[PDB]
RNA sequence: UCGGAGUACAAAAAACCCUCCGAGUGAUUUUAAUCUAGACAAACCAGUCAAAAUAAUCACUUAUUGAUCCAAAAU
């Protein structure tokens, strides 16, 4: 089995997370995380 | 001026209660692998014997500060069963009154994750907080 | 290090100092820290905030790239809207 | 002659884990006090717990030792039962590390008399 | 190279082609944030804790990791 490098986008402005992710994919990525800009929480989705 | 007029620099005061009730004063933030947490100015105790409801409040001197137990007299006779939930009601709000009349408003309560479920503990807090007093300590200043 | 250049006679520099590293008028040397844009997604939020922080590095070292580096870098500068001006100079140091 | 030895990688350094500060040592807030890989010294009034088991000063002071009563979180059920199954006479004890606080909490000067 | 024992009995440190076990990752959910006192450790480089101020866990748990430069990428 391998370890997948995974690209989060933020839905508002230029924010992005980066993480790791399983071959398997036991728990399919989507986040609730913190934005610097808006000083919030947000729905971070995964990306490339 | 008047020979009143001097006051000096740093003014003494001397009373124990005063710190604290300015919340500027010390708890200990501490211990954490032990238990209960002993962080606190007033800690509300409650002592579940198999015969007597006792309720006391302390401070971390260990002194016992204001306190109302079943075998007080005055309790004993205005009511029956000591162990029932309602002579749980009955100290608590015992013990709201007294509080008010020593003038703290604030204290601590650490029950027992199975001790949180019973009623008399449930009672006990809602007896306390009809009488006014209110749990969760105010945090501190600049800790 | 060239102590004497073939065409001017001259002390010459060494560039690659400083490419990473910022002189101060006090004589303190100033650095980035190793590894601050590598392999983030292991590390810890405490381990990248470590690795951004610029930091000072000890006698030896400044002692060193100081001999790496000719009297046009030890000048004093005033830039406009120069960030480490307020920096350059010592205060309050009883050795 | 073949000279195999099958055993590989004893060497590591040494993590240095021991007791930073002794009995009686003045301290500043934020002194590491002591830092252990299990808990040998718990902490005791004042003394904060990091993640990795060390143990630090809250406050301005003096670090002091002690023996004293140990009753473990109900959260942790480990301790709760060896807690448990003990005859009935006995308590356990640890060692705990504490700072005494050297420094008044605060003073009240006056700034302007109107 | 990296970590647990012993050797190295009670602060630290401590060798061998010494004696023995491990790691070059899994399993989840709760996505584990900024900024700054004081510290451990340390030749250097790397490593560690962390109050105040703003708004990760389990697997003995400790080891699961590679510096510059140069490349590709988007912000
Ligand atoms: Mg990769
Ligand atoms: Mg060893
Ligand atoms: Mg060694
Ligand atoms: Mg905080």
Redesign the interface.
Known sequence: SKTI?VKMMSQAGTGFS???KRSRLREKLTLLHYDPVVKKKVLFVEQK | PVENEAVAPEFTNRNPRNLELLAVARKERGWGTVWPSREFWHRLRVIRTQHHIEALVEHRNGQVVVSASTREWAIKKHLYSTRNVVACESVGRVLAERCLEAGINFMVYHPTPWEAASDSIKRLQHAMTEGGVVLREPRRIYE | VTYFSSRKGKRKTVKAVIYRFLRLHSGLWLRRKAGYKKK??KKTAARKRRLREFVFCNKTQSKLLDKMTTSFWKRRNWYADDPYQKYQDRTNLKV | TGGSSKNLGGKSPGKRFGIKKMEGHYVHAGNILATQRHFRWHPGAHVGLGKNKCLYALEEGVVRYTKEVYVPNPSNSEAVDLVTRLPQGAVLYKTFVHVVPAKPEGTFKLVAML
């Open positions: 490098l980066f993480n790791t | 983030l997604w």
